[PDB]
């Protein structure tokens, strides 16, 4: 009912820069055609909070996806590249930390506020991709 910690994430955000995303997708195991088309996308990310439930939507020409979750509570996620993963998202000192597990593999996506930006760091096996979003 009062202000939530994650309120700083709430809003509509647009992708403005990406680094190393193709390499990150390769490490995750994303196939050629999906990497090419997904790498071209300039998504909007819409984040909202309602009680304990955080919703993150990604809208792009490639795919529209949405996840809703409670911090610390594992859920099923079908990713944009059609991985069926088990996901858990927590808040660690202001940073949303999203761990995806599938097929004995794991990747971590961190989302944080930096100045007026929302910075998304995707990490797989030593490869990091940084994606920067600004308010739409």
Ligand X SMILES: CCCCCCCCCCCCCCCC(=O)O
Annotated binding site: 131-133
Residue 65 DSSP code:
E
Can you tell me the distance from the alpha carbon of 12 to that of 3, in angstroms, rounded to the nearest whole number?
18
- Residue 46, Cα to own-chain centre: how many angstroms? 11
Q: Show binding-site residues for a fatty acid.
A: 131-133
Q: Is 102 in the site for ligand X (CB under 6 A)?
A: no
For the CA atoms of 133, 111, 30, 33, what is the dihedral angle to 10 degrees?
-10
In Å, how far are 17, 19, 33, 125 from 40, measured between CA atoms? 11, 12, 11, 23
Q: Is 109 in the site for ligand X (CB under 6 A)?
A: yes
**How many residues can be counted in the chain?**
136
Give the nearest distance from C-beta 60 to ligand X in angstroms. 5
Q: Is 41 in the site for ligand X (CB under 6 A)?
A: yes
Q: Is 98 in the site for ligand X (CB under 6 A)?
A: no
Q: For ligand X, which is the closer residue by CB, 4 or 65?
A: 65
Give the nearest distance from C-beta 71 to ligand X in angstroms. 18
Q: For ligand X, which is the closer residue by CB, 28 or 51?
A: 28
Q: For ligand X, which is the closer residue by CB, 49 or 62?
A: 62
Judge residue 31's burial from the number of C-beta atoms within 10 Å of its C-beta, 0-12 exposed, 13-18 middle, 19 or more buried: exposed
Of 64-93, binders to ligand X (CB under 6 A) are: 79-81
CB 60 within 8 A of CB 45: no
Binding site for ligand X (CB under 6 A): 15, 25, 28, 30, 38, 41, 43, 45, 58, 60, 62, 79-81, 109, 120, 122, 131
């Amino acid at each position: 009912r009062g202000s939530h910690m994650c309120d700083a994430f709430v809003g509509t955000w647009k992708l403005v820069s990406s680094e190393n995303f193709d390499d990150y997708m390769k490490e995750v195991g994303v196939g050629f055609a999906t990497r090419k088309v997904a790498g071209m996308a300039k998504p909007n990310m819409i984040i909202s909070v309602n009680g304990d439930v955080i919703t993150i939507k990604s809208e792009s020409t490639f795919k529209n996806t949405e996840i809703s979750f409670i911090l610390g509570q594992e859920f099923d996620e079908v990713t944009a590249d059609d991985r069926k993963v088990k996901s858990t998202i927590t808040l660690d000192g202001g940073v949303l930390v999203h761990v995806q597990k599938w097929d004995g593999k794991s990747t971590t996506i961190k989302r944080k506020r930096e100045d007026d930006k929302l910075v998304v760091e995707c990490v797989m096996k030593g490869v990091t991709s940084t994606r920067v979003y600004e308010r739409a």
